[PDB]
Write an enzyme that holds these catalytic residues in place. Sequence first.
Site, PDB file in Angstrom:
ATOM      1  N   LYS A   7       0.798  -1.208   0.000  1.00 37.91           N
ATOM      2  CA  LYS A   7       0.000   0.000   0.000  1.00 37.91           C
ATOM      3  C   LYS A   7       0.839   1.270   0.000  1.00 37.91           C
ATOM      4  O   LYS A   7       0.303   2.357   0.085  1.00 37.91           O
ATOM      5  CB  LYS A   7      -0.979  -0.017   1.162  1.00 37.91           C
ATOM      6  CG  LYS A   7      -1.914  -1.207   1.092  1.00 37.91           C
ATOM      7  CD  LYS A   7      -3.198  -0.964   1.855  1.00 37.91           C
ATOM      8  CE  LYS A   7      -4.065  -2.238   1.894  1.00 37.91           C
ATOM      9  NZ  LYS A   7      -4.788  -2.570   0.616  1.00 37.91           N
ATOM     10  N   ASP A  26     -13.422  -1.095  -4.743  1.00 36.00           N
ATOM     11  CA  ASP A  26     -13.360   0.292  -4.405  1.00 36.00           C
ATOM     12  C   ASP A  26     -13.939   1.178  -5.471  1.00 36.00           C
ATOM     13  O   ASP A  26     -13.254   2.009  -5.987  1.00 36.00           O
ATOM     14  CB  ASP A  26     -11.919   0.697  -4.134  1.00 36.00           C
ATOM     15  CG  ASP A  26     -11.062   0.653  -5.349  1.00 36.00           C
ATOM     16  OD1 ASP A  26     -10.141   1.459  -5.449  1.00 36.00           O
ATOM     17  OD2 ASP A  26     -11.289  -0.195  -6.200  1.00 36.00           O
ATOM     18  N   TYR A  35     -18.126  -8.869  -2.770  1.00 34.71           N
ATOM     19  CA  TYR A  35     -17.165  -9.939  -2.618  1.00 34.71           C
ATOM     20  C   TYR A  35     -17.378 -10.831  -1.416  1.00 34.71           C
ATOM     21  O   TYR A  35     -16.533 -11.683  -1.141  1.00 34.71           O
ATOM     22  CB  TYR A  35     -15.730  -9.417  -2.589  1.00 34.71           C
ATOM     23  CG  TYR A  35     -15.402  -8.435  -1.492  1.00 34.71           C
ATOM     24  CD1 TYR A  35     -15.145  -8.858  -0.200  1.00 34.71           C
ATOM     25  CD2 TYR A  35     -15.302  -7.075  -1.777  1.00 34.71           C
ATOM     26  CE1 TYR A  35     -14.796  -7.923   0.800  1.00 34.71           C
ATOM     27  CE2 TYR A  35     -14.969  -6.151  -0.821  1.00 34.71           C
ATOM     28  CZ  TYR A  35     -14.715  -6.561   0.462  1.00 34.71           C
ATOM     29  OH  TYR A  35     -14.385  -5.580   1.381  1.00 34.71           O
ATOM     30  N   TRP A  49     -10.645 -15.719  -1.362  1.00 35.05           N
ATOM     31  CA  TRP A  49      -9.767 -14.822  -0.605  1.00 35.05           C
ATOM     32  C   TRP A  49     -10.124 -15.016   0.864  1.00 35.05           C
ATOM     33  O   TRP A  49     -11.233 -14.619   1.312  1.00 35.05           O
ATOM     34  CB  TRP A  49     -10.071 -13.405  -1.039  1.00 35.05           C
ATOM     35  CG  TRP A  49      -9.431 -12.324  -0.272  1.00 35.05           C
ATOM     36  CD1 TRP A  49      -9.270 -12.216   1.103  1.00 35.05           C
ATOM     37  CD2 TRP A  49      -8.914 -11.120  -0.838  1.00 35.05           C
ATOM     38  NE1 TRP A  49      -8.681 -10.994   1.404  1.00 35.05           N
ATOM     39  CE2 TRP A  49      -8.452 -10.313   0.228  1.00 35.05           C
ATOM     40  CE3 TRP A  49      -8.806 -10.639  -2.156  1.00 35.05           C
ATOM     41  CZ2 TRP A  49      -7.881  -9.064   0.009  1.00 35.05           C
ATOM     42  CZ3 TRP A  49      -8.249  -9.396  -2.367  1.00 35.05           C
ATOM     43  CH2 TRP A  49      -7.785  -8.623  -1.294  1.00 35.05           C
ATOM     44  N   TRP A  50      -9.236 -15.653   1.610  1.00 32.81           N
ATOM     45  CA  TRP A  50      -9.561 -15.952   2.998  1.00 32.81           C
ATOM     46  C   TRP A  50      -8.959 -14.908   3.957  1.00 32.81           C
ATOM     47  O   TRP A  50      -7.751 -14.810   4.107  1.00 32.81           O
ATOM     48  CB  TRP A  50      -9.097 -17.341   3.355  1.00 32.81           C
ATOM     49  CG  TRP A  50      -9.590 -17.824   4.702  1.00 32.81           C
ATOM     50  CD1 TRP A  50     -10.868 -17.744   5.181  1.00 32.81           C
ATOM     51  CD2 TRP A  50      -8.811 -18.471   5.740  1.00 32.81           C
ATOM     52  NE1 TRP A  50     -10.930 -18.297   6.448  1.00 32.81           N
ATOM     53  CE2 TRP A  50      -9.691 -18.764   6.800  1.00 32.81           C
ATOM     54  CE3 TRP A  50      -7.466 -18.858   5.846  1.00 32.81           C
ATOM     55  CZ2 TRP A  50      -9.281 -19.429   7.963  1.00 32.81           C
ATOM     56  CZ3 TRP A  50      -7.039 -19.508   7.012  1.00 32.81           C
ATOM     57  CH2 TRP A  50      -7.956 -19.801   8.058  1.00 32.81           C
TER      58      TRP A  50
HETATM   59  C1  LIG Z   1     -11.548  -8.771  -0.692  1.00 33.55           C
HETATM   60  N1  LIG Z   1     -11.273  -7.521  -0.011  1.00 33.55           N
HETATM   61  N2  LIG Z   1     -11.205  -6.366  -0.807  1.00 33.55           N
HETATM   62  O1  LIG Z   1     -11.345  -6.512  -2.004  1.00 33.55           O
HETATM   63  C2  LIG Z   1     -11.063  -7.364   1.285  1.00 33.55           C
HETATM   64  O2  LIG Z   1     -11.100  -8.327   2.019  1.00 33.55           O
HETATM   65  N3  LIG Z   1     -10.811  -6.134   1.704  1.00 33.55           N
HETATM   66  C3  LIG Z   1     -10.555  -5.785   3.085  1.00 33.55           C
HETATM   67  C4  LIG Z   1      -9.233  -6.372   3.519  1.00 33.55           C
HETATM   68  O3  LIG Z   1      -8.224  -5.656   2.813  1.00 33.55           O
HETATM   69  C5  LIG Z   1      -9.050  -6.203   5.019  1.00 33.55           C
HETATM   70  O4  LIG Z   1      -7.814  -6.839   5.413  1.00 33.55           O
HETATM   71  C6  LIG Z   1     -10.277  -6.762   5.735  1.00 33.55           C
HETATM   72  C7  LIG Z   1     -10.141  -6.687   7.249  1.00 33.55           C
HETATM   73  O5  LIG Z   1      -9.626  -5.410   7.633  1.00 33.55           O
HETATM   74  O6  LIG Z   1     -11.467  -6.068   5.304  1.00 33.55           O
HETATM   75  C8  LIG Z   1     -11.705  -6.307   3.928  1.00 33.55           C
HETATM   76  O7  LIG Z   1     -12.841  -5.569   3.538  1.00 33.55           O
END
Ligand SMILES: CN(N=O)C(=O)N[C@@H]1[C@@H](O)[C@H](O)[C@@H](CO)O[C@H]1O
Length: 579
Positions: A156, A233, A272, A327-328
């Site tokens: 980032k 986003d 997502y 995405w876990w």
């Molecule tokens: C799939 N995804 N963004 O595309 C995420 O999981 N984004 C954030 C992710 O970046 C973040 O680590 C977690 C917990 O703080 O919250 C999610 O919303």
Amino acid sequence: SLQPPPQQLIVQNKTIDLPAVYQLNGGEEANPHAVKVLKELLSGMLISIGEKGDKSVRKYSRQIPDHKEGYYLSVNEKEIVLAGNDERGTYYALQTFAQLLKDGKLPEVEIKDYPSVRYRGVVEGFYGTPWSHQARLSQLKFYGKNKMNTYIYGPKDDPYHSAPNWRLPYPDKEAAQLQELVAVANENEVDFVWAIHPGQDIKWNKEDRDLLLAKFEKMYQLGVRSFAVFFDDISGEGTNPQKQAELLNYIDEKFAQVKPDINQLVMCPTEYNKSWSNPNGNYLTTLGDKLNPSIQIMWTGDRVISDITRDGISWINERIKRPAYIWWNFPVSDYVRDHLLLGPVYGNDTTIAKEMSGFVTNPMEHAESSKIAIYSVASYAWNPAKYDTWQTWKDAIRTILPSAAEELECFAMHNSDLGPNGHGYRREESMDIQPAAERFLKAFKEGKNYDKADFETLQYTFERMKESADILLMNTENKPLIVEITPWVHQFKLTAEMGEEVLKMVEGRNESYFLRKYNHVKALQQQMFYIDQTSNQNPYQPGVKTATRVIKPLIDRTFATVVKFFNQKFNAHLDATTD
Ligand SMILES: CN(N=O)C(=O)N[C@@H]1[C@@H](O)[C@H](O)[C@@H](CO)O[C@H]1O
Ligand SMILES: [Ca+2]
């Protein structure tokens, strides 16, 4: 103890020696990356290495599994066979071969292996301090060792993948570092997936579309061969799944279908997880319908933080009409930044490998500390049906810090829960001594004799935490890991000491001793507040919490109770609170 466990494994119970003299067959023909590893293990007997179709592995091609990334490995006194279905597979054969070698000696075995999930690795998707360049080189090599093939790259503090500078080329210096990542990801058979994050300032016009294309082409020239586009986003026009599909298909056709060697092409949807999905909307099924079938869709489960279930992945698979690419969000601790999440990896269904296209873990901002979960994920993703939470947790720890594995185990055992948090996501912790803790306390609370054995177990735990803390802090086998966890270790030592003194209050010889302990506890609670105000200071959950699910409350509650008992006894008024 192979990690990840091979799909099929036969052991002979004979064991030969790495041959002092050998004859390499296929040296010229096999994946250079695997052979380089073989040469390093080999610093006479026939050793055959190659991919299917190589002249060197002809004799064994019916033994080679017909799966992407599969291999055949063989060991007996006549020969050694290391044979991939493709190049990456031979490299994977070698990663297994290296785990077999113990003291210039090999067991006699036969293995047929392949991964059950097509894509497996790490998404660099956590808020907080981004990893250093060095931490990332180290991650990449750890991925190859554990047969993870995916690295989704997103520091980032690099603005050239998001608004507005995604439009711009990497400057020389950053470019070369990035090339270096790609070089290292190649050597270790990892797909470097460069992910672009445009949604913030993207225009649905043809010029912005073209700028993205050219950006992708620049990353191509720097060596990237896999890509992700993020839509989590974005706002307004940008949220149209129809238009998202068009742009992605557009990139597929004008770019991915036009280069010879583009591996992954992946998008992150605007919805997502199921809970942020609008059942009164269209988004997912429209995406499922309109997006080219070879493009992956990422998905985090039922909620932002969620374990993957069979119900959970049917629900998303039905809609996007393909297997979700998971995405876990564990062990990422960016919303519980005052905790380390060092526990084992569990909760994901072990029979759903066909149902998922990828499995990636979002780790902590603590790069080395995250290796425990990462190694576990690699194991789970490669062979879910043989996945063993706890053996894989112990294996990870023994791998990361062999010279003090019991100590990291003790420390990690008591640093796994998140504590209460906005996401409602929790983990077990301190399960080993939970029963003794709870019995001692119930009995103790109600003036009823507790059990000597429970008391001794608690004692024993505190003593062992202090030993482990102190070994950990001075350990020099993995300095980065130690640097990362130090504040928490100090905190963990303080917790243990606090426990010891409280237990001494329970044993309570005489009134004067009791006040010494009492004051010593206050002073120790006090250094804990110090550490928690001066270490790990971040805007969101500043500080350092440790052993919080079972241990710190046992100590706090035992402290309150013993003081109470003391105040009745001597008509005193000592403050009974732990805060
Ligand atoms: C799939 N995804 N963004 O595309 C995420 O999981 N984004 C954030 C992710 O970046 C973040 O680590 C977690 C917990 O703080 O919250 C999610 O919303
Ligand atoms: Ca070849």
